[PDB]
Amino acid sequence: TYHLDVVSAEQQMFSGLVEKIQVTGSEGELGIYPGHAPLLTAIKPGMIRIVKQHGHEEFIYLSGGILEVQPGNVTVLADTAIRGQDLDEARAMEAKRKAEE
Amino acid sequence: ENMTPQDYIGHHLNNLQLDLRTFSLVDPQNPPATFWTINIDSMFFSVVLGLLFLVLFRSVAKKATSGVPGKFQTAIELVIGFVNGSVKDMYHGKSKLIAPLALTIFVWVFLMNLMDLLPIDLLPYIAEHVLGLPALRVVPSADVNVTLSMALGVFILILFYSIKMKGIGGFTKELTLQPFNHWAFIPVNLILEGVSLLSKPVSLGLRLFGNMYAGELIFILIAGLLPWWSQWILNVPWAIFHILIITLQAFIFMVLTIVYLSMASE
Amino acid sequence: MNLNATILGQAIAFVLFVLFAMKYVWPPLMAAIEKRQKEIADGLASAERAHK
Amino acid sequence: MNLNATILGQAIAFVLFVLFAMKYVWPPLMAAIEKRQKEIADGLASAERAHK
Amino acid sequence: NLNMDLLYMAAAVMMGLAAIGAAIGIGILGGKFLEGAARQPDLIPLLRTQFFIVMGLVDAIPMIAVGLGLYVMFAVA
Amino acid sequence: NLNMDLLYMAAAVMMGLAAIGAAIGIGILGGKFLEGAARQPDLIPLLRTQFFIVMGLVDAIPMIAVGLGLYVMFAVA
Amino acid sequence: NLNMDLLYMAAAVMMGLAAIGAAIGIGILGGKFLEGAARQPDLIPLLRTQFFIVMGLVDAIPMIAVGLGLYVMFAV
Amino acid sequence: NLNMDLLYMAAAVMMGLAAIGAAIGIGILGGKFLEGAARQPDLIPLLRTQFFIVMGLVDAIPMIAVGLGLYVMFAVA
Amino acid sequence: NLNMDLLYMAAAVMMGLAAIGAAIGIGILGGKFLEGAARQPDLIPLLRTQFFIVMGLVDAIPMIAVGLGLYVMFAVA
Amino acid sequence: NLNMDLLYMAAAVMMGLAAIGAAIGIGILGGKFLEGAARQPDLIPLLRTQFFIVMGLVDAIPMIAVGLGLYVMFAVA
Amino acid sequence: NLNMDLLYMAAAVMMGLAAIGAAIGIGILGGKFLEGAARQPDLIPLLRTQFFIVMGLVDAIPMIAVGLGLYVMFAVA
Amino acid sequence: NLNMDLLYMAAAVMMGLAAIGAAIGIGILGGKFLEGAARQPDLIPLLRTQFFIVMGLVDAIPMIAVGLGLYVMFAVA
Amino acid sequence: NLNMDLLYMAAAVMMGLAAIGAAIGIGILGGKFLEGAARQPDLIPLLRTQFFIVMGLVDAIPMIAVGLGLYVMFAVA
Amino acid sequence: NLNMDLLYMAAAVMMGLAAIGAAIGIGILGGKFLEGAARQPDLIPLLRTQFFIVMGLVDAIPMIAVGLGLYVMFAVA
C-alpha cells in the first residue's frame, strides 16, 4: 500500500496509507494503484475517490490543484477555490481599484 | 598481359588452395569441386595475425609494471578497458574463460578485417610475380571457412556451457516445452526451438562473412571496372566508411558471443 | 563461394590463441591494473584515517 | 588493358586516405594521453600526498 | 543456358527483401535509441549496450538471407 | 532442368518474406523496449526478460518459413 | 514435371504471407503488451493472460494458411 | 495436368492477402485495448466487452475470402 | 479453357485487396474508438453511434469489390 | 478469341487498388475525427461537417477508378 | 489480343496507383487538419484555407496519372 | 505489335510509382506544415516559405521520373 | 524486337523504386525538420544546415539508382 | 543470346529494393536525430556522433545489395 497526502496551503485535508484512488486528471480520470510509476499533472475540480487501506472507500471534493506520484509516496496539492484566469483577473482588478482608493 | 577487365576480376575471386593428399597447388584456371583443399592464403594470414597480436601483447604484458605509464601500455590498457567493460556487465558467472575468449575473438577478427585496407593488387603481385604463386587474396574473414569455424566453435560452447550450468534434465524441458508449454505441442515445439538454437552461431558467421566479402568486392570493382581518375575518387570515401564498418563489426561479433552464451547459462 | 577443409585448421588456431591469452596475457595484465588502482585506494584511505 | 592505371589510382587513393586518417583519426589518441595523466599520474600523486 | 537467368533473379529477390527488412528494422530501433539518448543524456553507453543486444537479434534472419544469396550467386550460379 | 530453376526461386521468396516479417517484428518490439528502458533505469533487467519471452513468439512462424526454405533449397533441390 | 514445382511455388506464397501476418500482428500486439507491462508493474500476470486470449485470435488464420502451405507442399 | 495447376494460385492469393488483412487489423485493434487497460484496470472488463463486438466486424470480409479460398481449393480443385 | 481458369485468379485479387482494405481501415477507425472509450467511459453510447455512422462509409467500396468477386467466381466462373 | 480474360484482370487491379485507397484514407481521417470528438463532445455537429468536406476529396480518385472498373467489366468485356 | 488488353492493363496500373497515392496522402494531411481543428476551433477557416493550399499540391501529381489513364483507355485503346 | 505495346506498360510502372512517392512525401511534409501553422498561427508566412523550399527537393526525382514516362509514351512509343 | 523493349522496362522498375525511396525518405526527414522549426523558430538556420547534411545521405543511394536508369535507357539503348 | 536481358532486370530489382530500404531507414533514423537536436541544441556534435554509429549499422545490408547489383550489371552481363 502507498502513503497518500492530500494537502492545501491553509490546512492538510487528508493523509495515510491507501490501496488505490481515482482522480480526474487534466487529460482524464486515472486510477493510482499500488507502487505506481512516477507522474505529475493538473487535476480538475470535482469529487475524487479514495479507497483507504483495508478497503474504506470515500469521496473528497477538491477545487483543483496538482497531483504527483513516485514509487513510495504520492501527494495532491489542492487549491481552495476554483482557479481560472477570469476569476484571478477579477480579484486582481478588485485589488487595483482598491489601490486607487 | 592477358587481362581483360572481367577476366582480371576473376583472379581476385580465386584463392590459393593446397591439396591434402598430394600437397599440390590447385590452379585458378580449373577449380574442381572438392572440400579437401585448404586455402593457404586464408590460413596463413589468419595465423600470422593471431601470432602478431600474441607477440605484441604478451611482450609488454610479460614486462608490465605499475610505474610511469608507457605509450603502447596505454593502448593495451584501453582495449582491455573496452573488453573488460563489456564482460563486466554482460557476464555474471564465475567462469575464467569468458574474458579471454571475447578478447581474442575481438582482436583477431579485427586483424583479419584490417587487411582489407591494404591495396588490392600489391601483395598478390608479390604472390604471383615474385614467389611464383598461382593466386591470392588477403582477407581471411572474406572466406567462409574461417568464420564458420569460429561460429561453430561458439556453437560447441553454447551446448557445453548450457549443459554444464543447468544439466540435461532442464535442458530437455526448455527445448521441448517452449514456447506454448502445453503437452500436446511438444513434438512441434522442439522443431522450432532447435533451429532457433542453430540460427545463433550461423548468423554470427554469415554476418561477418558477408560484410568482409562485400568490402573486398568494392576494392575488386574499383580496380577492375574503373579508370585511374575515378578509382581514387571512389576508393577514398569507401575506405573511410569501411573503417567504421570493420570496427563496429568486430565489436558486434564479440558482444553477441558473450550475449548468446549468457542467455544460455545465466 | 566453396566450402573447404580450411574450417578445421582455423579451429586449431582458435583454441591455440585462446590458450596463449588465457594463461599468459590476461592474468599479468589484470594484476598490473589492480596494482595501479590499489595505489588510489590506499592513498585516499590513509588521508581519511588521519582526518579521523 | 593497361594495368599501370589501376596501380596509380590505388596509390593516389591510399595517399588521400592516409591524409584523412592522419588529420582526423590520429587525434583521438590524445584522449588516451588524458586517460594517462588524470587517472594514473594524478591519482598516484594524490595518494602520495595523502601518505605524507 | 536457362540456369543463370533465374538463379541471379532468385538471389536478387532474396537479398533485396533482406535489405528492406534489415534497414527498416534498425531504422525503427535506432530511432527509439536516439530519442532515448536525447531524453536522458550520459546514459548513452548503457542504452548503447541494450541497442547492440537488440540489434544482433534484428539482423539474424536478414543475415541468413544475405549469406544464402551470396551462396546462390557465387556458388550455384 | 526447370525444377531446380523454380525451386531456388521458391526458397528465395519464402526466406525473403520470412526475413522482412521477423526483422520488422523484432524492430518494433525492441523499440518499445528501449523507450521503456529510457525514462527509468530501475527495471532494465526486467523488461529485457519480458523481451525474450515475447521475442520467442515473434520468431515462431518465420523459422518455420526458414526451415522449409532451407529444406527446399538443400533437399528438394 | 511442370506440375510439382508450381505446387511448391503456391505453398511458398501461402506460407510466406502467413509469416508476414503472424509476425507483424504480434509485433503490434506485443508492443502494447510491453508498454502496459512497463506502466502498471503489478499487472503483468493479468495483462499476459489477456495477451494469450488475443494471441489465439491473431494466429487463427495464419495457422490455416500454414496448414494449407504444408498440405500443398507435402500432402498434395 | 494443365487445368488445375492455376487454381492453387487463385487460392494462394486470397488466403495470403486475407491473412495479412485479418492479422494486422486485429493487431491494431487489440493494441488499443491493452493501452486503455493500462490507465484504469477496473475498466479492463468494460473495454473487454467492446473488443469482441468490434473484432466481429474487423474479420468479416477476410472470412469470406478464407472461405472461398477453401472452396476453390477443395471443391473446384 | 483459360476463359474459365483466369477468372478465379481475377476474383482472388479482388477479394484479397478488398479484405486488406476493409480490415486495415476498420482497424484504424475502431482503435480510435477504443481509446476514446478509455478516456470518457460516459460517452461510449455516443461514440458507438458515430462509429457505426462512420463505419458504413469504409465498407461502401470493399463490398462492391466483394460482391463482384462473388459474381465473377460463381456467375461467370 | 482469348482476349476477354485480361479485361477482367485489368478491372480487378483497378478496382481492388481503389478499394485499398478509399478504405485506408477514410480510416485515417475518421480516426482523427473520433479522436477530436472524444476531446470536445459538444463540437460533434461541427467536426462532423468538416469530416464530410474533406472526405469528399479523399475518395474522389477512388470513385473514378471504381466507375471505370465497372465500365471495363460490364460495358467492354 | 496483345494490343488492346495490355492498354487496359496499363491504364489499370496508372489509375490504381494514383488511387493509392491520392487517397492516402489526403488521409494523412486531413487528419492533421482535424487535429488542429480540435485544438483551435476558432481557426477552422484559416486552417482549411491552408489545407486547400496543401491539398492542391498533393492531388496535382496523381491527376496527371488519372487524366492520362483516361487517355490511354479511350484515345489509344 | 508487342514491342511498343509493352512500352506503355513500362511508362505506367515508372510514373505510377513516382505518383505514390510524390503524393505521400508531400502529404507528410504538409502535415507538419499545418501542425506548425496551428501551434504558431502568427508564423504561417515563414513556415509556408520553408514548405516551398523543401517541396522543391521532394519532387525533384519524381518530376524527372514523370518526364521520362511521358517521353517513353509520346516520343519512343 | 523484345531485347530493346525489356531494357526500357528494366529502367522503369529501377527509377520507379528509386522515386519511392527518395520521396518517402525526405518526406519523413523533412517532417521532423519542420517540427524542429515549429518548436524553436530562431534556431532554423542551424537545423537547416543539419538537414542538408542528412538529406545528402538519404538520396545518395537513390541517385546512383537513377544514374544507372538513364544509363540503361540512353546508353545501352 | 537472351541471357543478357534478364541480368539487367535482376540488377534493377536489387538496386530498387536497396534504395527503398536505405532511404526509408535513414529517413526514420535522421528524423529522430532532428527532434533530438530540436530539444538539446548544445548536444548536436554529440548526437551526430551517436547518429553516425547507428547509421553505420543501418547501411550495411543495402550497400551489399547495391554492390552485388552493380557487379551483375557490369561484370557478369
Side-chain angles (χ1 to χ4, degrees), chain E residues 5 8-9 12 15-16 18-20 22-24 26-27 30-31 33-35 38 44 48 51 55 63 66 70 73-74, chain N residues 3 6-7 9-10 13-14 17 21-22 24-25 28-29 32 36 40 46 50 54 57-58 61-62 64 68 71-72 76:
Chain E
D5 268 346
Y8 293 120
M9 184 58 82
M15 316 183 70
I20 315 289
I24 311 287
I26 309 294
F33 164 44
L34 295 176
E35 83 171 82
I44 285 157
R48 201 198 309 119
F51 168 66
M55 166 267 296
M63 286 295 208
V66 169
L70 289 160
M73 268 205 52
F74 305 98
Chain N
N3 174 247
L6 267 293
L7 313 195
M9 194 83 190
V13 71
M14 273 186 285
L17 304 169
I24 309 169
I28 313 152
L29 178 70
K32 289 295 200 296
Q40 297 259 12
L46 176 61
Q50 314 316 125
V54 180
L57 277 38
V58 178
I61 319 307
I64 296 169
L68 297 179
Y71 158 82
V72 171
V76 178

Side-chain angles (χ1 to χ4, degrees), chain H:
Chain H
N1 299 3
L2 182 69
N3 302 335
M4 309 302 211
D5 68 22
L6 204 294
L7 286 145
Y8 298 100
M9 199 70 78
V13 197
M14 306 179 88
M15 318 187 76
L17 306 171
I20 303 181
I24 317 176
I26 313 166
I28 310 151
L29 176 70
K32 281 291 195 304
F33 164 43
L34 273 48
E35 156 171 348
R39 299 185 77 263
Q40 306 210 353
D42 292 280
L43 303 189
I44 207 164
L46 169 63
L47 297 172
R48 192 193 300 141
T49 67
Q50 314 306 148
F51 173 56
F52 288 103
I53 299 155
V54 179
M55 173 275 166
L57 290 41
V58 166
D59 80 15
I61 302 287
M63 293 303 213
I64 317 301
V66 163
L68 284 76
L70 290 161
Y71 168 83
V72 170
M73 189 165 143
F74 292 95
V76 189

Side-chain angles (χ1 to χ4, degrees), chain L residues 51-74:
Chain L
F51 171 60
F52 297 155
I53 296 287
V54 312
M55 175 262 305
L57 279 40
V58 177
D59 282 21
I61 310 289
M63 283 285 200
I64 77 183
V66 171
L68 291 164
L70 290 164
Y71 156 84
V72 166
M73 295 176 56
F74 296 114

